[PDB]
Amino acid sequence: EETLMDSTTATAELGWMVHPPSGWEEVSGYDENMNTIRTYQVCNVFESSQNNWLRTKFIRRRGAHRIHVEMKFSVRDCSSIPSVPGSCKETFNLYYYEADFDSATKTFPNWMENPWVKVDTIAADESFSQVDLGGRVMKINTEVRSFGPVSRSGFYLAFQDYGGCMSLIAVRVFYR
Amino acid sequence: SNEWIQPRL
Structure with a gap:
């Protein structure tokens, strides 16, 4: 029902912090309806030791206690992936962190679980739409996860990659 | 399969 943040509605660049700048990257990309939106992409499959974070802007709570996060990706x-090494991955983690004000900077919070709280490891389900951008297939999955109770002025989300190849197409955060 | 997502180098 009630939207706290929708990346799909951005009237300009996302502006989301990426750490390191070599990992996630803001790129224009398609909707399910082939509308062109801002997305984040990471695909460092030819590099060892990948730990790539992406973090939303501060999202206000506006009275919510349970938060729902809808991800298209x-x-x-x-x-x-031709010639890919065997360490290739096909999931990402989702985390949140609450705060009393927009306290995030380039180095705070630490880019790691604790102070971030892990919501879940996210993977592609076997429900989907697939189209031929021919002949490359675009397959968009949808996953919802939720967390709470949430109590402070607002929160941030984080998305962590560790050696896969993917695009986060949309994030919709809502309550009730 | 999403073959439009280019690796980095």
Whole structure:
């Protein structure tokens, strides 16, 4: 029902912090309806030791206690990446961190679980839409996860990659 | 399969 943040509605660049700048990257990309939106992409499958974070802007709570996070995203399919090493991955983690004000900076909070709280490891389900951008297939999955109770002025989300190839197409944060 | 997502180098 009630939206706290929708990346799909951005009237300009996201502006989300990425750490390191070599990992996630803001890129224009498609909706499910082929509307062109801002997305974040990471695909450092040819590099060891990948730990790439992306963090939203401060989202106000506006009275909510339980937060729902709807993610649209596309994973590439390690099988479908020519010459890829065996360490390739097909999931990302989601985290939140609450705060009393917009306290985030380049180095705070630490870029790691604790102070961030892990919501879940996110993977592609077997429900989907797939189209031929021919002949490359665009497959968009949808996953919802929720967390709470949430009590402070607001919060941040984080998305962490550790050696896969994917695009986070949309994040919709809502309550009730 | 999402073959439009280019690796980095």
